[PDB]
Amino acid sequence: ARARKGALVQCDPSIKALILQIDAKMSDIVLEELDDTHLLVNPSKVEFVKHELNRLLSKNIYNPMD
Amino acid sequence: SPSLLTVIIEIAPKLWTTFDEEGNEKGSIIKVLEALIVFLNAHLAFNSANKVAVIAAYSQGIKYLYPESTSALXXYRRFRNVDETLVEEIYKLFELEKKQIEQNSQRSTLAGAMSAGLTYVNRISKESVTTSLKSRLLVLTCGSGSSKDEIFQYIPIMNCIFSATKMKCPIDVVKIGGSKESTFLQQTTDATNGVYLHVESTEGLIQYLATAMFIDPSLRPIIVKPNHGSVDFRTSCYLTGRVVAVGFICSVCLCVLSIIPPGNKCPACDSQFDEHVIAKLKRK
Amino acid sequence: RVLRGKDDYGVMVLADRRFSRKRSQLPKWIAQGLSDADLNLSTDMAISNTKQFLRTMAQPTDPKDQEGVSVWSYEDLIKHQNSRKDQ
Amino acid sequence: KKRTAKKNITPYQRGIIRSLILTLDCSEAMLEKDLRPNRHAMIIQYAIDFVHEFFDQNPISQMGIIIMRNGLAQLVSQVSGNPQDHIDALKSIRKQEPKGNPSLQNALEMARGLLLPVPAHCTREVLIVFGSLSTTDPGDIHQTIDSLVSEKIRVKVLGLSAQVAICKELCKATNYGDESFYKILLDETHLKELFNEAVTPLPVNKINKGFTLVKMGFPTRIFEDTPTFCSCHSKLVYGGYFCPNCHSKVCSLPTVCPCCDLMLILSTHLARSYHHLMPLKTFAEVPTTEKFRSEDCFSCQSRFPXXXXXXXXXXXXXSRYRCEDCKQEFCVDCDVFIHEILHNCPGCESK
Amino acid sequence: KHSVTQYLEEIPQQVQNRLYTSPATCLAIYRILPPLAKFFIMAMVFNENEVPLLDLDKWVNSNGKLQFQNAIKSMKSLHLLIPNKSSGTLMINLNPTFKISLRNALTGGEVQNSFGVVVEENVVSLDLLDEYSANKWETILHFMVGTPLAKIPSEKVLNLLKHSKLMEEVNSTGEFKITNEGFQFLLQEINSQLWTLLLQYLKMIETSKMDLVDVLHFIFMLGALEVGKAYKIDALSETQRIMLQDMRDYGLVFQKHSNDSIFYPTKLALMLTSDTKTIRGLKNQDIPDGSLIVETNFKIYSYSNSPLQIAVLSLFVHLKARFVNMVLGQITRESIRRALTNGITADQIIAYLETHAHPQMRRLAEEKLEKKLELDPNCKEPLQVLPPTVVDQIRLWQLELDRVITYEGSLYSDFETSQEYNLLSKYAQDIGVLLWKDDKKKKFFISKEGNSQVLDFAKR
Amino acid sequence: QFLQWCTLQPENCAVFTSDNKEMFQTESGLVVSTYSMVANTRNRSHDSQKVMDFLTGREWGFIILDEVHVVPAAMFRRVVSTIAAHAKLGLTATLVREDDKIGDLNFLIGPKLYEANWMELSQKGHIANVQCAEVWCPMTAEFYQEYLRETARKRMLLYIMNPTKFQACQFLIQYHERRGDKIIVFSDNVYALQEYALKMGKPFIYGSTPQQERMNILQNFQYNDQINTIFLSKVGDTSIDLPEATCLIQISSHYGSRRQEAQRLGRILRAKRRNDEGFNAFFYSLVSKDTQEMYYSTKRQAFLVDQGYAFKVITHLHGMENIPNLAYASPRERRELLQEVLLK
Ligand SMILES: [Zn+2]
Ligand SMILES: [Zn+2]
Ligand SMILES: [Zn+2]
Ligand SMILES: [Zn+2]
Ligand SMILES: [Zn+2]
Structure with missing residues (x-):
């Protein structure tokens, strides 16, 4: 019985890349990257990936809303 | 699946x-009674507050026991009331036991009790459209003698199978008594997806009752535990009283005759047969 | 002419504006059937009216006791009722 | 106020054996907009229901199915005691759309010859659900009706919301002069009840025909399932039946044996004929002020019976619809239900 | 829903068996197990012997065996049984405390915590003492989610909500607002909400003087049956009575007046588990007294109303001018954006609208239902049940407020040949267990239902 | 475009401009003249007056009027100052008009018989089925980085250019070419449209298309199915003799005000005497999802459903990446074309 658990993050390669850019930004918590459309991460830190993803987008977007 | 388990006991x-x-x-x-009291509480408990009910048959009539028709006008405390109201209603049936009850032994109102139940x-299924009750019933009989095959109750047995098959009802039967496979019941338990257990007299049926008579309520994925084969070589030649195999069936009467037929007015309806048709049947 | 007996039916439509004012000029038994709301109809609600008519008429509405009123059953509802009517 | 029948003039013979062959209309007129999807689609819904009903109360019978497209009638399910053949045949048809005209002369012509193999004891029957208003006859139709009435093939047809004299005539002609058989709906439920009523045998006043003694035997289920084997389908069936005379494994069916050819029945089919043949007497609605019986029902225990004097509510009616031969009360529910599923009059059974 | 069942297995084996000490709590834990698990309990409750798994495996035939794995896995996690690698085989037997406490409570046994109720003149009327309890819920719910008047006076309750973060409202500022947890409070209706709060108080009231078995015995005593007389007086522990009185104050004990009487067995204790009918100065127009408006035009047509309810409706729609029957409000992508600002996903609101606002949307839902499920294989086009047009806008709005995705399961390996992966994948779509796959990688991150069955088929 | 399909023989109907002298006072049958003629400062040859002299001279029973509101009522009040016919006919086009003076033109022609309740009548079987759709072109970092950098409206072509948007268009092109259908595209860009028309490579109507080439492509478009894609810029409205609509695509969505968007929707979606396709009037709107006009793309959707046109969204394209000419498909070239379009 083999079963390798984790946090499978599947998205577009670009957000993946961004998430991976973001994931590289807090110390490579992505355990594995299954393909261009999937990522395997430790759930302990995915929370903060989005937080900085949020901040960096909040730093980036800043929401003009024209 | 709230399953309505309604027990009928004769x-x-x-x-x-x-x-x-x-x-x-x-x-x-009482061993069977104390078995039934425990059994009624369990299925009541099993499915989602799935209701129960009880009817009986006198020597000379029938009556409801747990449904407890309008009269005024422990362990979960619903087991208690179901048991005790049943215990009180049945003891009222035993005072309705005397010589006149002992009198009307010619008939067995088993036929009437089970037609009344289907009503x-x-x-209930008519009223309980909401929470459609995956109901299913039960039969317990004290196998008695003096009538090897009382054949006066055959048609209502078989008609109600259709309604039972028509209303899609699995029907389980347990016979307590001498080893007489009630062929008509044996076909009946077979006909409408049921389980036949001809248990012996004095065994506490609780082990038996729980095993094979809980099969259906809504489940029916499990091997029914019926008794042996359910042969459908049906009623004896009405004229002969021997079970026929190559039956000889009269006419619109539809009476079953053996190789016996009188050649005229089969012994269940006044229907003369074409002597040619009789001779054609005799061309062999 | 489209009608023969009391069991007969059929539509007798009138198609002209002047028919609105000549409803009285029609014979009584025709006039009894021509009601006020049936005047000057456009062709459209004519078809809906006869549509329901043919359907309802197509039904076997035979009470056989209201026909005791309108058929005056055999030699009796005349002899019973009318020989009472000699008043 | 009551809508109940006076008297039945036919409990004596019912056509217990049948060969009913239902024919449909897949013509343009079925595409008009009166019935909810159309004529075509909602007609087919109730036919499926009737199909299930027709074989439940006359399972000894068979049926075939024919459509009516493009002035050409087209058989879609053979005359069979297997409803699923017809049911599956009906499932495909609704997916095609009705077209062309109903050429009744076509449909009548193939119906008449389809029933020639149907024997004397089996009853020939045709049920036309006509919904268009014009036909297209390949030949003389009176020739065919004359040929039809000659073959002892009664015809009852269910016109849509209209009356057509020829099917007035056809139902009149075939059904022994007794025109009772062009009954027509105004309504879906009227259509629904038009379907349910076509299930039972159809006696009006039977003429004296050869009452033929019918020789058959009864099959018995097989046990060995690893020995899954069949003589009626040549496949691995985990247990079938065995004809009493042929001795060949036959799958579960009231169908005839396929090796010695005797009708295979267990017991269940004939008892539907019994309550078909000898039904009960209708539960009389007891008079309101003259009943004075138990304030309950009999088949069930329905304490609702009145309210004891309520000016209007009590002077209305006392829910005591009681059968006669038993003289036992029955709530309308039971009185309706007793008269609905289990004939088996509860009072008349216990005595 | 936190699925409180997962909490019972989380408490270690002993406190379960400690919990299992009262045949009440034996008889209680039994009703939540999956029906396969239920069936495997009672068999080996009475026949006083363990059973090999091969029989239990042969008892369950093909598909439905997944519930056979559903049964046995929940069974072991809460340790009401003891697996036994006795001779290399599997000897299955109850945690015996369960079976006999059950068997006792089955055959009139010693569940005195179960028998802790008392029967007396049950003066609690059907209408009496639960309107306070129902109003208790109404007032505190208006307090917790934020009503026009937040009449929730449960100081112990308010601390649990803020301390447990039950609502994403500023407890420091007194805010009772719906956060991610507060949005989840708006989702779990009766069980799940009744589940969710029972968890917060246990987390809150767990530091000192817990007595969890007594807490669980006392909680299961008040909700097990109407303790009636002697419940809050006698059939209650010290911390249990404080819990019972605290449950009394929270309404969950409809503890009768005088603060010292039998367990006021409010109906609130019943609903936490019953998962059945939910309906609870001197006027209360019901049941359809509530009302709302949700139709294809995406607008509120309110004729019936309820203030906390329309306050709740206003939590995701603008209110402009409450009229005689209508409240001036119109649901838009802006209106739901009031909740998406709170991170409230357009997921629970889906189930909310299909259930809630129905008392005015009965016909509207009923006309939407049309019974288009048996007609579904017949007429392949379902007739707008349930309304799909709203959810796509919600999803597209949710998709507009989105772009983070993740999956559960476990990555799998040792798939040696293409035939087994092709055969395993083909069967997986038959039961529907595979999130994403690829023959190239021979890896996928899904549930283990695929791995358990191939092992069981290979091994037995 | 209709009156010869109509029963009318134009031999009688003297068309008048007073640059267009025609047979006044001898015109035997019905007449078709125009306002600026019939009264204006554009009362500009005595053909005009003499027609009007004839208009007064001959007694007229009925007056068919088309868009009286645009031209001042005063001249209509002057074609209502002089002649005294018997009837008029106000076939008005808007509920509220600048000729809604307190004495309305309703109370001079005949009462209202036909109004904003266009549900009784057109539903009786006149109009066919029109399908509308709105594809969400997938997001790519630069557009957002382009969205991020400027909040200005200059993002307009920056999501219009989406090469993926070109792709979905080409799918319809091969699709409607496969179906023998006809495609209208509403693209007011010049470069990215050329960039796209270059990317497609069919004889293409585009920005400032030669009307003959327009007509040539149109002839090669409606009668010939080989060219089954034309691009109508803002020069279509207003106005050309707009071509038939089976597959309308709209790229630009500012095109304000919204009263025009009712116009364009009505104007660009012309009628089609083809029933081979199940939705014989496709309306499409290729929008880069997650861009500036999601607000304004959501503004178009509410308009159409108010107009009642059958509408849908197709973002799960069948073979989205399977189409030919995946030019600029990559986010880089979308970025590269985004740099290409930042010029525009
Ligand atoms: Zn006979
Ligand atoms: Zn076979
Ligand atoms: Zn045989
Ligand atoms: Zn009754
Ligand atoms: Zn009777």
Whole structure:
């Protein structure tokens, strides 16, 4: 019985890349990257990936809303 | 699946006598009664507050026991009331036991009790459209003698199978008594997806009752545990009284005759047959 | 002419503006059937009216006791009722 | 106020054996907009229901199915005691759309010859659900009706919301002069009840025909399932039946044996004929002020019976619809239900 | 829903068996197990012997065996049984405390915590003492989610909500607002909400003087049956009575007046588990007294109303001018954006609208239902049940407020040949267990239902 | 475009401009003249007056009027100052008009018989089925980085250019070419449209298309199915003799005000005497999802459903990446074309 658990993050390669850019930004918590459309991460830190993803987008977007 | 388990039990004080007669009087229906009291609480408990009910048959009539028709105008405390109201109603049936009850032993109102129940279930499924109750019933009989095959109750047995098959009802039967596979019941338990257990007299049926009579309620994925084969070589030649195989069936009467037929007016309806048709049947 | 007996039916439509004012000029038994709301109809609600008519008429509405009123059953509802009517 | 029948003039013979062959209309007129999807689609819904009903109360019978497209009638399910063949045949048809005209002369012509193999004891029957208003006859139709009435093939047809004299005539002609058989709906439920009523045998006043003694035997289920084997389908069936005379494994069916050819029945089919043949007497609605019986029902225990004097509510009616031969009360529910599923009059059974 | 069942297995084996000490709590834990698990309990409750798994495996035939794995896995996690690698085989037997406490409570046994109720003149009327309890819920719910008047006076309750973060409202500022947890409070209706709060108080009231078995015995005593007389007086522990009185104050004990009487067995204790009918100065127009408006035009047509309810409706729609029957409000992508600002996903609101606002949307839902499920294989086009047009806008709005995705399961390996992966994948779509796959990688991150069955088929 | 399909023989109907002298006072049958003629400062040859002299001279029973509101009522009040016919006919086009003076033109022609309740009548079977759709072109970092950098409206072509948007268009092109259908595209860009028309490579109507080439492509478009894609810029409205609509695509969505968007929707979606396709009037709107006009793309959707046109969204394209000419498909070239379009 083999079963390798984790946090499978599947998205577009670009957000993946961004998430991976973001994931590289807090110390490579992505355990594995299954393909261009999937990522395997430790759930302990995915929370903060989005937080900085949020901040960096909040730093980036800043929401003009024209 | 709230399943309505309604038990129908027949008590002729001549047949409960036979339950006393068989073996020794090592325990009358009370062992079966205390078995049933425990069994009724369990299925009541099993599915989602799934209701129960009880009817009986006198020697000379029938009556409801747990449904407890309008009269005024522990363990979960619903087991208690279901048991005790049943215990009180049935003891009221035993005071309705005397010589005149002992009198009308010619008939067995088993036929009437079970037709009345189908009116009751059609009545509850009609009302309980919400929470459609995956109901299913039960039969317990004290196998008594003096009538090897009382054949006066055959058509209502078979008609109600259709309604039972028509209303899609699995039907389980347990016979307590002498080893007489009630062929018509044996076909019946077979006909409408049921389980036949011809248990012996004095065994606490609780082990038996829980095993094979809980099969259906809504489940039916599990091997029914019926008794042996359910042969459908049906009623004896009405004229002969021998079970026919190549039956000889009269006419619009549809009476079953053996190789016996009188050649005229088959012995269930006044229908003369074409002597040519009789001779054609005799061309062999 | 489209009608023969009391069991007969059929539509007798009138198609002209002047028919609105000549409803009285029609014979009584025709006039009894021509009601006020049936005047000057456009062709459209004419078809809906006869549509329901043909359907309802197509039904076997035979009470056989209201026909005791309108058929005056055999030699009796005349002899019973009308020989009472000699008043 | 009551809508109940006076008297039945036919409990004596019912056509217990049948060969009913239902024919449909897949023509343009079925695409008009009166019935909810159309004529075409909602007609087919109730036919499926009737199909299930027709074989439940006359399972000894068979049926075939024919459509009516493009002035050409087209058989879609053979005359069979197997409803699923017809049911599956009906499932495909609704997916095609009705077209062309109903050429009744076509449809009548193939119906008449389809029933020639149907024997004397089996009854020939045709049920036309006509919904268009014009036909297209390949030949003389009176020739065919004359040929039809000659073959002892009664015809009852269910016109849509209209009356057509020829099917007035056809139902009149075939059904022994007794025109009772062009009954027509105004309504879906009227259509629904038009379907349910076509299930039972159809006696009006039977003429004296050869009452033929019918020789058959009864099959018995097989046990060995690893020995899954069949003589009626040549496949691995985990247990079938065995004809009493042929001795060949036959799958579960009231169908005839396929090796010695005797009708295979267990017991269940004939008892539907019994309550078909000898039904009960209708539960009389007891008079309101003259009943004075138990304030309950009999088949069930329905304490609702009145309210004891309520000016209007009590002077209305006392829910005591009681059968006669038993003289036992029955709530309308039971009285309706007793008369609905289990004939088996509860009072008349216990005595 | 936190699925409180997962909490019972989380408490270690002993406190379960400690919990299992009262045949009440034996008889209680039994009703939540999956029906396969239920069936495997009672068999080996009475026949006083363990059973090999091969029989339990042969008892369950093909598909439905997944519930056979559903049964046995929940069974072991809460340790009401003891697996036994006795001779290399599997000897299955109850945690015996369960079976006999059950068997006792089955055959009139010693569940005195179960028998802790008392029967007396049950003066609690059907209408009496639960309107306070129902109003208790109404007032505190208006307090917790934020009503026009937040009449929730449960100081112990308010601390649990803020301390447990039950609502994403500023407890420091007194805010009772719906956060991610507060949005989840708006989702779990009766069980799940009744589940969710029972968890917060246990987390809150767990530091000192817990007595969890007594807490669980006392909680299961008040909700097990109407303790009636002697419940809050006698059939209650010290911390249990404080819990019972605290449950009394929270309404979950409809503890009768005088603060010292039998367990006021409010109906609130019943609903936490019953998962059945939910309906609870001197006027209360019901049941359809509530009302709302949700139709294809995406607008509120309110004729019936309820203030906390329309306050709740206003939590995701603008209110402009409450009229005689209508409240001036119109649901838009802006209106739901009031909740998406709170991170409230357009997921629970889906189930909310299909259930809630129905008392005015009965016909509207009923006309939407049309019974288009048996007609579904017949008429392949379902007739707008349930409304799909709203959810796509919600999803597209949710998709507009989105772009983070993740999956559960476990990555799998040792798939040696293409035939087994092709055969395993083919069967997986038959039961529907595979999130994403690829023959190239021979890896996928899904549930283990695929791995358990191939092992069981290979091994037995 | 209709009156010869109509029963009318134009031999009688003297068309008048007073640059267009025609047979006044001898015109035997019905007449078709125009306002600026019939009264204006554009009362500009005595053909005009003499027609009007004839208009007064001959007694007229009925007056068919088309868009009286645009031209001042005063001249209509002057074609209502002089002649005294018997009837007029106000076939008005808007509920509220600048000729809604307190004495309305309703109370001079005949009462209202036909109004904003266009549900009784057109539903009786006149109009066919029109399908509308709105594809969400997938997001790519630069557009957002382009969205991020400027909040200005200059993002307009920056999501219009989406090469993925070109792709979905080409799918319809091969699709409607496969179906023998006809495609209208509403693209006011010049470069990215050329960039796209270059990317497609069919004889293409585009920005400032030669009307003959327009007509040539149109002839090669409606009668010839080989060219089954034309691009109508803002020069279509207003106005050309707009071509038939089976597959309308709209790229630009500012095109304000919204009263025009009712116009364009009505104007660009012309009628089609083809029933081979199940939705014989496709309306499409290729929008880069997650861009500036999601607000304004959501503004178009509410308009159409108010107009009642059958509408849908197709973002799960069948073979989205399977189409030919995946030019600029990559986010880089979308970025590269985004740099290409930042010029525009
Ligand atoms: Zn006979
Ligand atoms: Zn076979
Ligand atoms: Zn045979
Ligand atoms: Zn009754
Ligand atoms: Zn009777």
